Amino acid sequence: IDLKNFRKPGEKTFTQRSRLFVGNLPPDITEEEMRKLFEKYGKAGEVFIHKDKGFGFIRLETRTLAEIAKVELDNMPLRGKQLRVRFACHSASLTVRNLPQYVSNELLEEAFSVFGQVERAVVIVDDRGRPSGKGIVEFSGKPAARKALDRCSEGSFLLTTFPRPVTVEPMDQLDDEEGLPEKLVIKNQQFHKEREQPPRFAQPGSFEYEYAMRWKALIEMEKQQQDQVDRNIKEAREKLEMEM
Amino acid sequence: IDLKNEKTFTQRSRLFVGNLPPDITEEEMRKLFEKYGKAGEVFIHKDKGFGFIRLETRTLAEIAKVELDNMPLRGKQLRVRFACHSASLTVRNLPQYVSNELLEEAFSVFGQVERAVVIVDDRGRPSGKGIVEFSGKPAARKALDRCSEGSFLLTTFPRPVTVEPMDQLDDEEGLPEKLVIKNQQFHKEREQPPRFAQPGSFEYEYAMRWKALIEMEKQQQDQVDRNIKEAREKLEMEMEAARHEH
Ligand SMILES: *CC(=O)N1CCN(S(=O)(=O)c2ccc(OC)cc2)[C@@H](C(=O)NCc2ccc(OC)cc2)C1
Ligand SMILES: *CC(=O)N1CCN(S(=O)(=O)c2ccc(OC)cc2)[C@@H](C(=O)NCc2ccc(OC)cc2)C1
* CATH code, domain with A231: 6.10.250.1170
Please answer whether residues A119 and A80 qualify as being in contact, where contact means their C-beta atoms are separated by less than 8 angstroms. no
B172 and B194 part of one domain: no
Give the Å distance between the CA of A169 and the centre of ligand 1.
Answer: 20
B101 and B32 part of one domain: no
Q: Test A236 with B242 for CB contact under 8 angstroms.
A: no
Q: CA B244, CA B142: separation in Å to the nearest integer?
A: 35
Which burial class, exposed, middle or buried, applies to A110 when counting CB atoms under 10 A from its CB (0-12, 13-18, 19+)?
Answer: middle
B167 and B96 part of one domain: yes
B162 and B102 part of one domain: yes
Query: DSSP string spanning B111-175?
Result: S-EEEEEEEE-TTS-EEEEEEEEESSHHHHHHHHHHHHHS-EESSSS----EEEE----BSSS--
Q: Residue B222 carries which side chain, given as an amino acid letter?
A: D
B160 and B218 part of one domain: no
If one counts the domains in chain A, the total is 3
What number of C-beta contacts closer than 8 Å exist between A and B? 274
Give the Å distance between the CA of B51 and the centre of ligand 2.
Answer: 9
Q: Which residue's CA is the nearest one to ligand 2's atom 20?
A: B84
At CB < 8 A and 24+ separation, what contacts does A145-153 make?
A145/A91, A145/A92, A145/A93, A145/A94, A145/A115, A145/A116, A147/A115, A147/A116, A148/A94, A148/A112, A148/A115, A148/A116, A149/A94, A151/A115, A151/B196
Say yes or no: CB of residue A86 within 6 Å of ligand 1. Answer: yes
Q: Which H or E element spans position A224?
A: helix A207-242
A166 and A103 part of one domain: yes
Domain boundary among B176, B204, B232: B176
B58 and B93 part of one domain: no
Produce one character per residue of B59-68: b if its CB has 16 or more CB atoms within 10 Å, e if not.
Answer: bbbbbbbbbb
Q: Test A229 with B224 for CB contact under 8 angstroms.
A: yes
Please answer whether residues B126 and B96 qualify as being in contact, where contact means their C-beta atoms are separated by less than 8 angstroms. yes
Ligand approaching nearest to the C-alpha of A58: 1
B93 and B170 part of one domain: yes
* Domain CATH number, residue B127: 3.30.70.330
Interface check A106 vs B, CB under 8 A: yes
B157 and B192 part of one domain: no
Q: Which of A3, A182, A195 is nearest residue B63 as measured by Cβ atoms? A: A3
Q: Residue A20 carries which side chain, given as an amino acid letter?
A: L
Residue B227: partners with Cβ closer than 8 Å, 6 or more residues away = A225
Say yes or no: CB of residue A47 within 6 Å of ligand 1. Answer: no
Domain boundary among B149, B176, B203: B176
Q: CA A112, CA A96: separation in Å to the nearest integer?
A: 10
Domain containing B14: what range?
1-87
A101 and A175 part of one domain: yes
Domain boundary among A34, A68, A92: A92
Which burial class, exposed, middle or buried, applies to A65 when counting CB atoms under 10 A from its CB (0-12, 13-18, 19+)?
Answer: buried
CA-A46 nearest atom, ligand 1 = 29
Q: Residue A38 carries which side chain, given as an amino acid letter?
A: F
The answer for A133, left when phi > 0, alpha when psi is -120 to 50, beta otherwise, is left
